[PDB]
């Protein structure tokens with residue numbers, strides 16, 4: 338295998354993404370399953386170590402030995418409020434090794450423990466291999482992204498994850514900076530530009546305000562809701578259909594885990610359909626106690642069910658503007674990042690708040706960070 | 719009478735899903751035979767437990783594959799006029815549910831107490 342180019346990696350909480358700059362454009366690389374994003378999951382079994390889609394696909398089977406959310410642990414001390422709060426919800430064990438957290442699993446019949454950067458290094462190795470399989474060339478150089486709120490310890494742990502994975506980390510750049518580069522906001526002619534990055538994923542909500550002056554990026558403020566995402570919008574739909582089923586059939590499906598899962602999967606898919614259509618239909622045979630569940634949901638009803646959650650995305654926006662010491666009229670560009678920014682109501686709320694200002698949304702919001710990082714990787718090559 | 723070419727497309731998807739159910743059901747049948755083998759074998763009570771709990775990862779993998787079939791079936795939208803498609807879908811869901819009920823009885827017979 339010949340030596341290949343430098344790649345941009347978005348090392349995410351639940352999903353990671355890898356891109357490459359070639360023939361004057363960025364190509365977001367699909368994995369072995371044809372997916373442009375890879376789950377940030379690592380599973381330890383009695384025989385092997387699974388990473389990505391293979392690890393996520395057997396999570397029901399091996400809950401205790403399937404690790405995810407290592408990004409929430411990386412560079413943190415065991416006694417960190419975040420670590421203590423998040424481990425109450427994880428099915429895998431988090432232990433304390435001289436003040437540092439470690440994930441504890443059963444791997445090939447033996448009890449083993451790994452540091453968060455060791456788990457993230459396995460995800461990075463998988464991202465490296467995804468690039469190598471597409472290019473047909475060896476990949477060594479990479480630009481890896483981190484949140485703008487990450488401290489020195491979380492930044493260094495990420496660089497260490499890159500090093501353990503055999504990558505030459507050219508640069509660690511902020512995720513909002515990577516999104517702004519993707520849209521070339523640093524190359525626009527004019528005075529300093531105030532940019533608002535609106536990031537809404539499956540589980541986290543981050544707002545960032547950047548100032549770009551003469552090609553230099555400066556984070557003015559960060560705000561958000563660490564536990565707010567697409568999954569909360571699915572939960573509201575699930576609750577709506579559980580109530581609907583109770584009204585029609587006088588039966589509670591919520592204690593049948595398999596019925597709830599069949600409903601949840603159908604809801605998440607119906608939610609995606611509502612980003613382009615005004616109605617989504619669902620047909621689930623023998624959902625619970627032999628009853629067929631044939632229903633539909635309009636975009637209007639989906640928006641009513643999530644009204645408080647959607648509107649609530651503007652409070653961290655106002656918080657960020659306050660801290661950045663800027664009026665909304667001083668924002669030059671708004672960038673959408675995260676799968677959930679595809680929701681028309683969220684785009685409408687954000688646009689109305691900025692009195693009709695157009696949003697930078699042409700680059701797939703799930704891939705924008707990886708995109709900016711690939712551009713940065715090509716510049717540093 | 720009013721059989722459409724559009725329904726043939728839906729029947730083809732259901733036939734590919736029926737073949738997948740038949741593959742998972744063959745795995746369940748092998749699990750049932752291995753379970754009987756351990757039960758009617760010469761393994762001491764202690765090694766029987768290891769052998770029966772070694773079937774657990776396998777039974778859970780069978781349940782999961784049946785759950786993924788149900789999720790694939792649930793992506794279908796069949797108009798009322800597609801009567802044959804609705805019957806084949808309903809028959810296939812009930813068959814997967816009857817096999818999941820068998821998987822559940824195996825799960826209640828291994829890794830006990």
Ligand SMILES: CN1N=C(N)c2cn([C@@H]3O[C@H](CO)[C@@H](O)[C@H]3O)c3ncnc1c23
Pocket residue numbers: 537538539540566567568605608609610612613675676677678679680
């Ligand atoms: C149309 N369209 N297309 C997508 N690919 C997508 C992903 N999402 C959500 O974003 C999150 C991923 O971090 C999960 O909660 C997904 O359900 C979406 N929400 C709404 N409309 C969407 C998507």
Ligand SMILES: [Cl-]
Pocket residue numbers: 364365366367
């Ligand atoms: Cl590709």
